[PDB]
Amino acid sequence: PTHVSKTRKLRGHVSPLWRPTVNLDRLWTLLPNEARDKYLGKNTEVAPVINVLQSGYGKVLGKGRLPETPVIVQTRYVSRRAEEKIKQAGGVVELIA
Amino acid sequence: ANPRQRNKQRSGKPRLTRRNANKKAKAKIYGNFVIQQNWDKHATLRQNYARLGLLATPNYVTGGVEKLYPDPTLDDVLDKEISIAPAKTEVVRQ
Amino acid sequence: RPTVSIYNKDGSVSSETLALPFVFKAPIRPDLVRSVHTAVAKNKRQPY
Amino acid sequence: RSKPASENVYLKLLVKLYRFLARRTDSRFNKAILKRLFQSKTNRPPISISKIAALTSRKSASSQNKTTVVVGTVTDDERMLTVPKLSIAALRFTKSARARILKAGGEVLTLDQLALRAPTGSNTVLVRGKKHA
Amino acid sequence: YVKTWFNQPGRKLRRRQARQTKAAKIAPRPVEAIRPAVKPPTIRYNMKVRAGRGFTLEELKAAGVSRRVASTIGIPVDHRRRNRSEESLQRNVERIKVYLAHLIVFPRKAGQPKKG
Amino acid sequence: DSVFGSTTEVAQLKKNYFLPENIISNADVTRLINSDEIQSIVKAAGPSRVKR
Amino acid sequence: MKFSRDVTSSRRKQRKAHFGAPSSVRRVLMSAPLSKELREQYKIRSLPVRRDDQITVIRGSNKGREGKITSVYRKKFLLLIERVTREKANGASAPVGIDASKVVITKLHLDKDRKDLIVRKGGKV
RNA sequence: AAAACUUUCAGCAACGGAUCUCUUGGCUCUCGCAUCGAUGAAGAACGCAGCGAAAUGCGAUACGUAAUGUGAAUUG
RNA sequence: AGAAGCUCAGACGAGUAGGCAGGCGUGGAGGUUUGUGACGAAGCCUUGGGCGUGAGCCUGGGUCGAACAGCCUCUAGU
RNA sequence: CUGCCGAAGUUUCCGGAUAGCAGAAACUCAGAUCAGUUUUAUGUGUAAAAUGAGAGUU
RNA sequence: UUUCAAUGGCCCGUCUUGAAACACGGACCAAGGAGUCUAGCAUCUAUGCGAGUGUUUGGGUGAUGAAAACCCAUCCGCGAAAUGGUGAAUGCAGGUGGGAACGCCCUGGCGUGCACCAUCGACCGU
RNA sequence: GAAGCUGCUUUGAGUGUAGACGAUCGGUCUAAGUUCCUUGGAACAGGACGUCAGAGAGGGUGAGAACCCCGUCUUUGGUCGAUUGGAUAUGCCAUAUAAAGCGCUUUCGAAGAGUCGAGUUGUGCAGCUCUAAAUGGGUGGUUCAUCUAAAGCUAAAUAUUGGCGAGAGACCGAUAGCGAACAAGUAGAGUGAUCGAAAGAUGAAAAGAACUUUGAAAAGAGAGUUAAAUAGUACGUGAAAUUGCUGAAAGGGAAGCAUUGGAAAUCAG
């Protein structure tokens, strides 16, 4: 406001390829909370599917540890260490065209 | 302000006033008689269409709808016939 | 929760009651409301 | 800074409460808390629930029942999945952090509740947030 | 030259009135036509599905509608778009087939002379 | 209760809105100070306005 | 409160309309209330005044004076009444004008036109 | 060294039109609408009233005629 | 105990450029004062009185004849 | 309108960056370091008692 | 308040200079009269939320003024990953020292040790 | 797409009437104090007692009016006429020996030239010179993809300092706001193109000062009107500069100012 301006007090003083990246530690966070309660920590024959393309991510990177629960990761691209950690956690990677 | 506008400001002839500026007025229904009878003039067209059992748009709506109360593979599909749709409103049945 | 008694057309207390909504326990902020009101009471200003 | 620029009435109430506690006790904890309440938001960075979980069970761990105290916001850390039991007193909790701590863990506290529980700061871990920003 | 938006509320109400004036003219029928479902043309957007312009001549023919009566009952036609995959064809056939099942078509008045 | 919700229950008429949480639990610090917990640990209360 | 967007609540436009109204409108502007006996007789709250109407001055210095209407001076909103005049310095009589709202009609000048107007405004003749 | 004269102060009277109060005006924003002319337009000139110069209205049918509405004025 | 407050003690006081803080006044807006007013609002005048370090404020009398202000916030053609 | 703080007055490098003087913010420091000062000692310079002051940095 | 006496008192503003003086401005009074609005960027402070955040292009809706308030579908902006295609806990997401704060003791000792700073260390900046 | 074939599905460029639903124009309809007292020239003020309210917007009325008047609300309508729009029902007429969609093919399928383009000179476009093609030509991409120029029409969303109206505003308040609130592009200036002002307020009502007297007259003095002429058209309020008069005081080639008191005047406690 003009009233609080300090010129009110000077009166009188003479004056590429689109590819957002997601790391492994956030892969389970993308999935909703009720599915995590169902699939995470339980040895179920059916595994959850995390299509990281539908969540606005182009590539899955390898930062972080995944929990030992297997999970199917559907994506376009994946860093070489990321899918190493994925099968070490028991999951598989399905590259999406 | 203009010489044209000052011309009639000083003139004795009254202005050609038409009182047509009634906002908030929703257009009345001609066309279908059944719709006209069951249509109430206060509600919007989206509220009237929903109440009468009709669709204002067959597509998605490009905004958040209103909420007044806290609500509680070719062959099998290319040749399949949808078993019509039920009429839930008496107007739609009408 | 506390209950509030409902009053009839003649001012007599009705036997029905309602639990106090949680909104009545919200923090009461003169500083925040004044700032929001300052900006919101500016949104129907015609230009000059 | 003899007073905070914040016009929040409840922040002024906390400052009043810890003005008394700082001067009517001999706790260097209470003097520290009063100073950090005066500090601006720039100098009060948020601390994550994961860093709190780390600093409790770090090295020799020995967290026991010690209550974590931070003058700031305890933001949640969605990367960590299984949340330990924690007791934190803070200015604010993000809705995620408060929900996660309560569901699988201990309790959340405000700075007035802590002053009742541990007026002298006994068995309290005074944790700051990373200012590297 | 500065453009101002003081008529932003005035424009919003004028369009809501225009929608209301449409419904006055044509009451038992929707104020919008049925658009198809298509997939955007880029690697960034091909996962999504948005509304196209009209249903291709093969989508109409497969559904059972002819390209002449399609406009009459409110089904836009797109002579330019084509079906490069069965996925797009089967998706829009069911969009029409749902439309036809949910549609009430009032009969017209047919002129008929005394003799044939 | 549906318009505003609570601090732990979502508002039904406002998608993803929870009531704000306060900085303090009890908004009366006077009784907080005069509580037994704090009074039992404070050092000896010095004098008020003193003689010159 | 006004709710129509066709009626103006502007003081500027109300004074301009009142002070620039033509004689056909100033006739309706200068109305006077009917007396108690006339109101219970005609079921009419108020009428526009007319020459040769027996009225009774209600307010002003001339309160209580009674007389007919000699000329409704529509162009300055003043009513002129017989035996209600002001004596100038030179002895001439200048009639004193009173606003129509300050008088009360005690005997109407009934014509065919007024009678239809009475029964037009929900009244009994 | 008394008056005059000059100056200062106060009172009254002048001169002046500030201040205050308002205001059929301006300015700004929004809204609805689309209608000049060879069937002579916009503009110009001259005229017309019982008593008129401007403005307004009008065109030798000249501060208007017909029709329609109102219902008893106009007014110096 | 308007803790924004109350109280005790000591020292210091020019100040350009510059830096920092608190105040006075004006037009209009939201709130408020069971606010003032034809038994005289505003304005103006006065060798009338009072308050403040100061910007300024209140008041007596006279004149005047229709509106005006205090506090809390907003705003600026201040 | 009042109150408080308060300079430089010019080096050093290419109109300037720098430093210096003045402030702010955030740190650690009181069994500590400073100093437009004087002594003592070693050969004017260097090093360690007197006196004063809380002293530092970013 | 006016006046007298004693004592004191050089015309204000601007400009130039180390400094004056000069050099302009000023007959008198009233009213008007000059760091404003906006776009971007950056600092600091406050506020809301916080790995998120941003309702107001637009749609819904709004009977009491409806240019307000209210509600939000899909996108999008910045942030969450850097480096020059690839793309990150080796090691409690690493040890040593100083350190805020706390605890146990009989000033000091011991333990714990945030922020930050020097240190050995890694991983593709973390 | 044409032409054949096939067999299912189709049909008015009419003309009346009736009623309903809309739009436009005009006329018309509308709740409650003007009871008492006090102040005042005037009550619309204060007080007392009431009323209406889907109306307590605003304006007028002799000072602040929901109840005196116009209005406002009801009206997101009643009524009366008009003039019209797209439907519905129904009557009459219908040139059907007709027209169309879909489906089938041992039959066919025309597609725009001084234009594209090349060269050059100017600012994709234009001039100049030269001047085409028919799975051709245009435009993209690493052979492919896409399009079909050199002919044409087309509502809506969009713009709008003008034109016909309207409703508003944290706008200006007569040196402001448009140059112009009045008189305004006027008075006035210039050969001309053009340039371009100043100027709002008596009172509720003109009741605008009869009459007498002086004076040639303008005017003056008594008088009179008004609540008021400290409202007399040189008109609300009447500031400062400046000027005249009266009172008090001071003054030997400046003056204003400051400090301390006296004297005179005038206040306060």
CSV table of C-alpha atoms in Angstrom, one decimal, chain D:
chain,number,residue,atom,x,y,z
D,1,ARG,CA,15.3,-10.7,18.6
D,2,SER,CA,13.2,-9.8,21.7
D,3,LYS,CA,9.9,-10.8,20.0
D,4,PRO,CA,8.8,-12.7,16.8
D,5,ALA,CA,7.5,-11.0,13.7
D,6,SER,CA,4.8,-13.7,13.6
D,7,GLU,CA,1.3,-12.3,14.5
D,8,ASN,CA,0.0,-15.8,15.3
D,9,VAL,CA,-1.7,-15.6,18.6
D,10,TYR,CA,-0.8,-19.2,19.5
D,11,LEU,CA,2.9,-18.6,18.6
D,12,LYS,CA,2.7,-15.6,20.9
D,13,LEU,CA,1.2,-17.8,23.6
D,14,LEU,CA,4.0,-20.3,23.3
D,15,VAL,CA,6.5,-17.5,23.5
D,16,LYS,CA,4.8,-16.3,26.7
D,17,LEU,CA,4.9,-19.8,28.2
D,18,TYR,CA,8.6,-20.3,27.5
D,19,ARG,CA,9.5,-16.8,28.5
D,20,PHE,CA,8.4,-17.8,32.0
D,21,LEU,CA,10.0,-21.3,31.8
D,22,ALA,CA,13.3,-19.9,30.6
D,23,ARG,CA,13.6,-17.3,33.4
D,24,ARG,CA,12.0,-19.2,36.3
D,25,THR,CA,14.1,-22.3,35.8
D,26,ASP,CA,17.7,-23.1,35.0
D,27,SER,CA,17.2,-25.3,32.0
D,28,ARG,CA,19.5,-24.6,29.0
D,29,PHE,CA,16.9,-26.6,27.1
D,30,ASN,CA,14.1,-24.1,27.9
D,31,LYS,CA,16.4,-21.2,27.0
D,32,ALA,CA,17.2,-22.9,23.7
D,33,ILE,CA,13.5,-23.5,22.9
D,34,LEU,CA,12.6,-19.9,23.5
D,35,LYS,CA,15.4,-18.7,21.2
D,36,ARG,CA,14.3,-21.1,18.4
D,37,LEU,CA,10.7,-19.9,18.7
D,38,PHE,CA,11.9,-16.4,18.0
D,39,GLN,CA,13.8,-17.6,14.9
D,40,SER,CA,12.2,-16.8,11.5
D,41,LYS,CA,10.9,-19.6,9.2
D,42,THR,CA,14.1,-19.4,7.2
D,43,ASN,CA,16.1,-20.4,10.3
D,44,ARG,CA,13.6,-23.2,11.3
D,45,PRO,CA,13.9,-25.8,8.5
D,46,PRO,CA,11.6,-28.8,8.5
D,47,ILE,CA,12.9,-32.1,9.8
D,48,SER,CA,11.7,-35.4,8.2
D,49,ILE,CA,10.1,-38.3,10.0
D,50,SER,CA,12.9,-40.5,8.6
D,51,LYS,CA,15.7,-38.3,10.0
D,52,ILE,CA,13.9,-38.4,13.3
D,53,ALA,CA,13.6,-42.2,13.0
D,54,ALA,CA,17.3,-42.2,12.1
D,55,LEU,CA,18.6,-40.0,14.9
D,56,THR,CA,16.7,-42.0,17.5
D,57,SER,CA,18.1,-45.4,16.5
D,58,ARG,CA,21.5,-44.1,15.3
D,59,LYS,CA,24.8,-45.7,16.3
D,60,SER,CA,24.2,-47.1,19.8
D,61,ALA,CA,20.5,-46.3,19.3
D,62,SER,CA,19.3,-46.3,22.9
D,63,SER,CA,16.2,-44.3,22.0
D,64,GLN,CA,14.3,-45.8,24.9
D,65,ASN,CA,11.4,-43.5,25.7
D,66,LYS,CA,13.2,-40.2,24.9
D,67,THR,CA,10.9,-37.6,23.3
D,68,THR,CA,12.2,-35.9,20.1
D,69,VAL,CA,11.7,-32.1,20.2
D,70,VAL,CA,12.0,-29.9,17.1
D,71,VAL,CA,10.8,-26.2,16.8
D,72,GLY,CA,9.4,-26.6,13.3
D,73,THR,CA,7.5,-28.8,10.9
D,74,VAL,CA,7.9,-32.6,10.9
D,75,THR,CA,7.4,-33.5,7.3
D,76,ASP,CA,6.6,-37.1,6.3
D,77,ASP,CA,9.0,-39.2,4.4
D,78,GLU,CA,7.0,-41.4,2.0
D,79,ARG,CA,10.1,-43.3,0.8
D,80,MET,CA,10.5,-45.2,4.1
D,81,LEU,CA,7.7,-47.8,4.4
D,82,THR,CA,7.6,-49.4,7.9
D,83,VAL,CA,7.4,-46.6,10.5
D,84,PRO,CA,8.9,-47.2,13.9
D,85,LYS,CA,7.4,-46.1,17.3
D,86,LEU,CA,8.3,-42.5,17.9
D,87,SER,CA,7.4,-39.7,20.3
D,88,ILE,CA,7.9,-36.2,18.8
D,89,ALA,CA,6.9,-32.8,20.0
D,90,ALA,CA,7.0,-30.1,17.3
D,91,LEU,CA,5.4,-26.8,16.2
D,92,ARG,CA,3.5,-28.5,13.3
D,93,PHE,CA,3.0,-31.9,11.8
D,94,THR,CA,2.1,-32.5,8.2
D,95,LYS,CA,-1.1,-34.4,7.8
D,96,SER,CA,0.8,-37.4,6.4
D,97,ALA,CA,3.4,-37.4,9.2
D,98,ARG,CA,0.8,-37.1,12.0
D,99,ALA,CA,-1.3,-39.9,10.4
D,100,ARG,CA,1.6,-42.2,9.9
D,101,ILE,CA,3.1,-41.8,13.4
D,102,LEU,CA,-0.3,-42.3,15.1
D,103,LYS,CA,-1.3,-45.4,13.0
D,104,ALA,CA,2.0,-47.4,13.5
D,105,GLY,CA,3.9,-45.8,16.3
D,106,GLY,CA,3.7,-43.7,19.4
D,107,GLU,CA,2.3,-40.2,19.8
D,108,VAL,CA,2.5,-36.6,18.5
D,109,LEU,CA,2.9,-33.7,20.9
D,110,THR,CA,2.7,-30.0,20.8
D,111,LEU,CA,5.2,-27.7,22.5
D,112,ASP,CA,2.8,-26.9,25.3
D,113,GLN,CA,2.1,-30.6,25.9
D,114,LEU,CA,5.9,-31.2,26.1
D,115,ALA,CA,6.3,-28.3,28.6
D,116,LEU,CA,3.8,-30.1,30.8
D,117,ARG,CA,5.4,-33.6,30.4
D,118,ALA,CA,9.0,-32.5,30.6
D,119,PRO,CA,9.2,-28.9,31.9
D,120,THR,CA,13.0,-29.0,32.3
D,121,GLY,CA,13.6,-30.9,29.0
D,122,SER,CA,14.5,-34.1,30.8
D,123,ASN,CA,14.9,-37.1,28.6
D,124,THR,CA,14.3,-34.9,25.5
D,125,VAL,CA,16.3,-35.0,22.2
D,126,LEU,CA,16.5,-31.5,20.8
D,127,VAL,CA,16.8,-32.0,17.0
D,128,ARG,CA,17.3,-29.4,14.3
D,129,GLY,CA,16.7,-29.5,10.6
D,130,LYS,CA,19.3,-29.4,7.9
D,131,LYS,CA,19.9,-25.8,6.8
D,132,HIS,CA,21.8,-26.7,3.6
D,133,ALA,CA,18.4,-26.2,1.9
